Amino acid sequence: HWGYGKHNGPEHWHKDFPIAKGERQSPVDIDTHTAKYDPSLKPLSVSYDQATSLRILNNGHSFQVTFDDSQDKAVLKGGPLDGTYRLLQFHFHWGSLDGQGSEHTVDKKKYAAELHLVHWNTKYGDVGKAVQQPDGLAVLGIFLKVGSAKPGLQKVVDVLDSIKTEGKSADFTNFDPRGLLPESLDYWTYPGSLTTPPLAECVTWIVLKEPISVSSEQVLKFRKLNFNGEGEPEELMVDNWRPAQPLKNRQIKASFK
Template sequence: MSHSWGYEATNGPSKWGASFPIANGDRQSPIDIVPGNASHDPGLKPLKLKYDPSTCLEILNNGHSFQVTFADDTDSSTLTDGPISGTYRLKQFHFHWGATDDRGSEHTVQGAKFPAELHLVHWNTKYASFGEAVNKPDGLAVVGVFLKIGNENAHLQKLIDKFSVITNAKTQTTFVDFNPATLLPGCLDYWTYLGSLTTPPLYESVTWIVLKHQITVSSAQMAKFRTLLFSSNGEAPCCMENNYRPPQPLKGRVVRASFK
């Protein structure tokens, strides 16, 4: 495979610092969230997530994960309030997962991993575009949702049903009228901290909003995630799994909680 970075021994997270020195910066993500050390902040507002299914455009395999992209030229799908000020537009969502059901999330809670983690990526509309916002200290806000093994998730299944079309890297297909709000738990209590992208270029531009409560996924559905490939058509097949970065040092940052 020709990717300059990835999740193999030769190009995985332990090697990223060679090409992206910010990997050793002061606000890198993910982190291990220790609930007992998180500070309850009564000033944190409830999250306001407004998603319009008509802004959903396509689903793709980018060689690192699968991603669903959205039209972000209007304020139809936005995140407001919570720990942020202003309006952030939804750009895309993607997942990270492991080779087995007992690992796969990027963030951990008291050292515990979940099978997978969903990231909903939003950009600050005080900037002209996602491209302009992506490297600014307040440029992005990402909502993280943990997946836990349980009942089959009918909403996730709508994504999984498209996997046969996007099995190989650099493949995509139209994917419309999907509401990402269906991938959120009923309670939106959250932890928040200042961090970074968890993939290169690792910009320290993310206000992280990690939800306390999880959504379910069945073991059979998680197995389907692992049928996707890091490799492109014509390359030796390489299963897409363990596409997560380990927790990074907190380096004095404060994790705040919206709940007691």
């Protein structure tokens, strides 16, 4: 199956998922001088006070923290969005080196990592229905640069030893995702897709202008994870990012001036 190596990586995905070459693929480069300020964009409403985390999981492509989405507990609304989107999971994409690790780029600049907080539109009832809809998902993207540690990330870093290999999961209750957010909620937005197979074109992307800083020790522990499962030849989980895709007939809008 698909992965991020030479023989199964992003250049191969279109053979199993021809939408890889579609009209609204993600990620993209954010050209800040070409994105237009849109005064009609409302502020984002990130309501994570009641968030209920469940498990942390190595899925062989990233690690993921899942949340209870059976009620409106942690929701995203406002911004470019209509209606209510429930937080389902977050995961990261990161590099083998600090100069690469993000999927979106900003004026071609690559960040060391990128956080994706994945939400689905409650009008569609369940995630599986939502991924079949052009407005089914909203993913909040947050860039990571290497500098000072991010305290709200350390509980995640602390547990990665226990999910080293594909298929491992662990209890990860009572985690507060508000500690992963930067100060400003200024954002860029555009219509796009999942950045992993099936690459469904179901995502309103909301990418925050302000990166969070993480320490070298924190991102180092990302790079200790493995793509393989236990008892297999070790391949470090690094460079699990899809490169920027053609913007095609799309406008990136900015919530700020």
